[PDB]
Amino acid sequence: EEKEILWNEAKAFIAACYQELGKAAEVKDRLADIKSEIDLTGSYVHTKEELEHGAKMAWRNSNRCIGRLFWNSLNVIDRRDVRTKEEVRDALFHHIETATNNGKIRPTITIFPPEEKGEKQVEIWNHQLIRYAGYESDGERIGDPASCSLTAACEELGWRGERTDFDLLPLIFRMKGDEQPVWYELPRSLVIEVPITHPDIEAFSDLELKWYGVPIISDMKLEVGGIHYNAAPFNGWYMGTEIGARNLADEKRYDKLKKVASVIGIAADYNTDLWKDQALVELNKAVLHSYKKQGVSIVDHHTAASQFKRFEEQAEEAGRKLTGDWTWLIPPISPAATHIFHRSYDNSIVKPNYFYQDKPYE
Amino acid sequence: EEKEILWNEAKAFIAACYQELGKAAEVKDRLADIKSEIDLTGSYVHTKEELEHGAKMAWRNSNRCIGRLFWNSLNVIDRRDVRTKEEVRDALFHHIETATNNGKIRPTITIFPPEEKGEKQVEIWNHQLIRYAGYESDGERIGDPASCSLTAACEELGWRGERTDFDLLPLIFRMKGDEQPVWYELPRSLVIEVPITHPDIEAFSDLELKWYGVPIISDMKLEVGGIHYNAAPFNGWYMGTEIGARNLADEKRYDKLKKVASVIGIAADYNTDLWKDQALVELNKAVLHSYKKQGVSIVDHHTAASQFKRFEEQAEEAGRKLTGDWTWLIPPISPAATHIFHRSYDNSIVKPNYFYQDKPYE
């Protein structure tokens, strides 16, 4: 059944891909080559053009993503040539550097060799290339709780964190044939971080909050025409609410709202005072202000929604069906102030696309 | 097919209703009476006990309602005896009075005679018993845009609004046999209104905002055991966000956010300043403060979500499946600060329940 799934997915992808690229006349012959390659080898190899456009289509089909307007400008790096862990490490180092671009973030994806028989060539353990460690023991909570299990796994492998609230996790990945992953400490010269200050409230720096500049998600599987790219880290730039309304605000994350309320000088005693809401707004204002001040790309949820509206309009004009996940598209701050809140979206899964996969730790 | 639908729905309701009331031994005999009544008359008549508990179950099954913890304390008024429009008018007047309760709102439902052959005995045109008129002509927008079509229909019937932003619509309903509805101006002594002031910002009263005290929804159909109560107005108390985040804030409603920003002294020029978010918070703080100050019941979205959590816990303990609409349960202000945002709900329709029905105007 494996092979038929591959062949059926391949036909659908190549057709649609070549239609979009104005290469419709080449479909018939290309499908022939693929069909032979599948019978003879068990799989097929994408051209540079198919891979690039495939990763772009996958972004375009990501139902939960509000930033999809810019799907066609994705920078695709083909690293299907890597064979050694040093090559993987250097490819990951390069991705961080070129995506960061001194603060003017370039949306980028680096694509490593795909699974063969469901056998991974490269297996990346990090959720994001840059992420903070988390610790929990005897009631003592330090760092990012969302990283607790990966942190513990890294410390099994010889690594040790300084146990600040902002320890950078090392890169950690496993090569085909090795039983254990290797880990590499991040060169700090590659990592841009932003200290959180407030435009009007000087005391906000007493919180000593900061966040990293570029979210580089590295544990999702890119699927293109039946081929499973389990290792393909990608990045955009942040929407402010991701940091201010969730990462720093969630009770199961950094849980900073009570401390925010204190430094902005409001009581945190009564629900009817809406102190959490007010604290959320000021923290989110601080996040946008700080990134802007440092010259690191970021977008606010209002602008992002306006861009997404243009994505919707572009889709209808191009004659493509629009898919989306309403529950993820609405921002966690003032959702009813965006157009997204006031319409519905079809949540059907279209491929190419990015998917969750099981964690090798846990 | 009509009759079988009635009989099948009746069996399910009476069984569940009598189980909950500890009257399980009475089901068999009651179903017999009903079955005969249906064959002979084409319908059946609920006991006072069935009607009361039926309306409570219907509230309990309302997927979109965050206030369901208090389902069992609903005050049920049986007005299946009414036959004249004066009786309907006086029943509606009484509902407003007893529900308002001098500000200490009592959740109440008044139940009028049900449809017979799908033929309505009483047909209420108002969306809510107390609601503001809306006008639109030659670019001139006045009042509540959501009331524009009903307002125009009322003005066809001899009524005329003063064209303030807060004209009270008259009660308007039609009796079986009449071709046109009648309308009755609301006695102002029955209507509690709350002027919107801010706890810290004196200039907020320059906006001259106000809202009515009690939301009494009067255009939904109550369905209980196959019986269609198309006329059954009900009320709770407001959650603040309904007024501050939607009614006064939506661009297609009162659209007050730019004026709010001005009186609270912030610029409304840049998305990155998050001025809409800040204006939303202050407006919502003002709404809660004002209602509290006037001694009119209201709940904030944080308290309401905490109550809903207890509803969830109560359901599991009672062995009842929980249903809900995530998209409606999350508040439009700081939704991620509530537990609701972080779990999922089954949106299956369970009866008894309240349903939309077609507008007789439009």
Ligand code: HEM
């Ligand atoms: C260019 C800037 C971008 C912005 C502002 C943006 C914005 C967002 C946001 C806010 C989320 C929700 C994340 C969460 O709540 O955890 C999201 C989800 C997502 N975005 Fe984007 N995005 C961008 C670029 C990209 C790129 C380049 C890709 C991949 C090529 C991508 C694919 C996705 C995917 C797959 C998800 C869902 C992740 C999940 O289900 O956990 N986005 N995006």
Ligand code: HEM
């Ligand atoms: C006791 C105070 C109550 C509170 C605070 C409350 C809260 C809410 C809120 C905030 C909504 C969303 C409304 C919207 O966004 O338009 C809602 C919807 C609803 N509530 Fe409640 N509610 C209460 C009592 C009741 C009662 C007494 C009933 C009926 C017996 C009821 C039935 C419903 C229904 C049917 C909806 C959905 C309306 C629709 O789909 O348009 N609620 N509730």
Ligand SMILES: Nc1ccc2ccc(CCNCc3cccc(F)c3)cc2n1
């Ligand atoms: N700005 C962007 C762009 C692309 C993105 C793609 C994926 C995600 C998901 C981030 N994962 C959040 C998360 C993952 C695991 C645990 C946890 F608490 C939180 C965010 C993006 N954010």
Ligand SMILES: Nc1ccc2ccc(CCNCc3cccc(F)c3)cc2n1
């Ligand atoms: N506090 C409560 C309690 C019960 C409720 C039941 C229904 C509704 C729905 C209110 N209808 C909103 C609406 C209806 C029609 C047009 C429009 F713009 C807005 C609100 C409740 N609010």
Ligand SMILES: C[C@H](O)[C@H](O)[C@H]1CNc2nc(N)[nH]c(=O)c2N1
């Ligand atoms: C299209 C979407 O379903 C619509 O805007 C809904 C979203 N969630 C909501 N939730 C509540 N409580 N009230 C509403 O009017 C809406 N509107």
Ligand SMILES: C[C@H](O)[C@H](O)[C@H]1CNc2nc(N)[nH]c(=O)c2N1
């Ligand atoms: C249970 C629920 O689906 C979950 O909390 C979702 C809701 N919507 C979301 N939306 C975004 N953008 N990010 C999230 O992490 C979530 N969490």
Ligand SMILES: [Cl-]
């Ligand atoms: Cl993140």
Ligand SMILES: [Cl-]
């Ligand atoms: Cl309302």
